[PDB]
Amino acid sequence: MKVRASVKKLCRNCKIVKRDGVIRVICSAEPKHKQRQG
Amino acid sequence: SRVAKAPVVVPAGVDVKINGQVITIKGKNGELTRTLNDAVEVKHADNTLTFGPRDGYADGWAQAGTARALLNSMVIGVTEGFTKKLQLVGVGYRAAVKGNVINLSLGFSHPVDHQLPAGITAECPTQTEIVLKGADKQVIGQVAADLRAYRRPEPYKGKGVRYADEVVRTKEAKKK
Amino acid sequence: DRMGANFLKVVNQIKTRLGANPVPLQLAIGAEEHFTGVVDLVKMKAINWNDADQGVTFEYEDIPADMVELANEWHQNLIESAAEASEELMEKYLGGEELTEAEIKGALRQRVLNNEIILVTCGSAFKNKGVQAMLDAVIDYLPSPVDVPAINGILDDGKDTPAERHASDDEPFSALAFKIATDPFVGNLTFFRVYSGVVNSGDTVLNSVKAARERFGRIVQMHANKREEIKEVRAGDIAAAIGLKDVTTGDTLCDPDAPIILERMEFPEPVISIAVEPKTKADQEK
Amino acid sequence: AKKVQAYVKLQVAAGMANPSPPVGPALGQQGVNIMEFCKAFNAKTDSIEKGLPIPVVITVYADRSFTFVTKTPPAAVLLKKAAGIKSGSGKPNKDKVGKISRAQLQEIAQTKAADMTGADIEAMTRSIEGTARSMGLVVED
């Protein structure tokens, strides 16, 4: 999970759910599109 | 809501034991009980079960919205069951069932034979296909996902242990 | 002696990819780790191997009880393989004359001169399991230089008359030149094989395809590595036709006033081209 | 006719026997002997002077079967068969070269009227005027 202050909804099918409070964004086929902070 | 427009119809062959918050479902081949939270108002009204969110816990529409989906699965799981098949794609990798134990030909210097708990009648038609049978929807995944986590799908060959319906995304080397 | 090593899969994979007709003979006993027997099906005998020794036992027994039916359904396909090899075994597959170990190979050996079936054998080289088994088929399923069509020297340019010469010692001499290695002792060396005829030591062996004169020096045989001087080369040995002044790929090694070959087929093309450069300017001289 | 299994209309000039690589996949969909589609159409291909892309459609069936529908060549390539060059659309509304009147357009529409139930005469007339303006062509009668 890459970390950066900006979670920008980047991939076309990008889920966003708030697990534990810190946002981590869920793609389907791209592992590269998953950030976690912010 | 959609969940409030979703009542569940218990059929004949599965008995409920409504001691208020604690419901123990006497079914076909097991006992699928869940001790829910106090954000629910349960009533097996006539035959079709009706539920309700308790006051104070107005977020119990969520907490019983779990429950409406829950008990529907329980009355159909204790009778019919889940076929949870896994596909072993590994070079020299086999699967064979004995009693309640599964072998794991997993490319190690030592064998891995793990015993599997109750609510499991496992089978193996061949070395690469493995049945799992169960009554709870949780236990039919939890014992399945532990095997898959021992050898995850490798996205350079397609190697690994993977589900029947799961479709991996294998890549290409592209350098050497 | 490995995982995923199914013997019956691979021989029945040839009929799908290679499209050939293999009928295997020496089958498998053991779950690849406690593997002890190789199932020869003609004599219907399993062979014991070494506990872990580099080569003690050859103990033949019967078919074990754990494979009493797979030997049944596979032997009946072995004895099929002579009724459709020769036409004469067709009426005793169905009539029920006994298909012995010695009778069936007399048809199948003639099925190696046309090569429609190949003979397969499972076992281990490194675990010393099968190597002592694999030798007896070579004298009975691989052809001899006197059982084959021998040296066939055609002519030169006059007429196409292919002439089967004799495989015995009663012919003009004949050989071929291949695997022509080098050495810092004598220079050029060969790994040549003589098909028939006998040569003495010291001869005006020519190379009659490229019009050059050579003389036959001190011939040396090997254990693939060690110099052993072979003086008298008999018909069928493999040695080193030493001291050839010029020699090409596959020309004759033959006395004059004799039959003559002129044959070079499938000259290859080395494709990838890299340019070597010297280190010192004294190096480019060498 | 059929449904979500397969329906693609792709065929180009039938002087080429071997399936052209990009057409290949529309024959590489439901397991054909590619010699069969070469031997089906050539009985009627000897009634033409080849050079124009003639279209066919593919449509499939359960076991190993297939079917196909023969029509006439479209008027889009018939616009640029008479005009000499096969590709004129470089600038649509800035090129004024080349005239064919409506009489040519209807006689290449009777061969549509004798073949197909859509692509009707009077409705295609503005689109056979519409494929003229995109190519940069003029029309007068």
Added chain:
RNA sequence: AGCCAGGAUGUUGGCUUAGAAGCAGCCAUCAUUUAAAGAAAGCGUAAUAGCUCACUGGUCGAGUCGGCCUGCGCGGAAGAU
């Protein structure tokens, strides 16, 4: 929002055609049928077969959706007996 569900089909959409064949990119950017379809969004990809968005055409049978303004909240937030 999901299961059935056609992805109605003129066309090869050029150019330059080697494939730039709706899926590389610049100019057009009409539509034969319009109760469902654009000369077009990605993946499959040299091109396409596979899978969709397009209208949800038929079922559920009620609410639902994207942004503007504020009350507060979370992440951002790592230091040295």
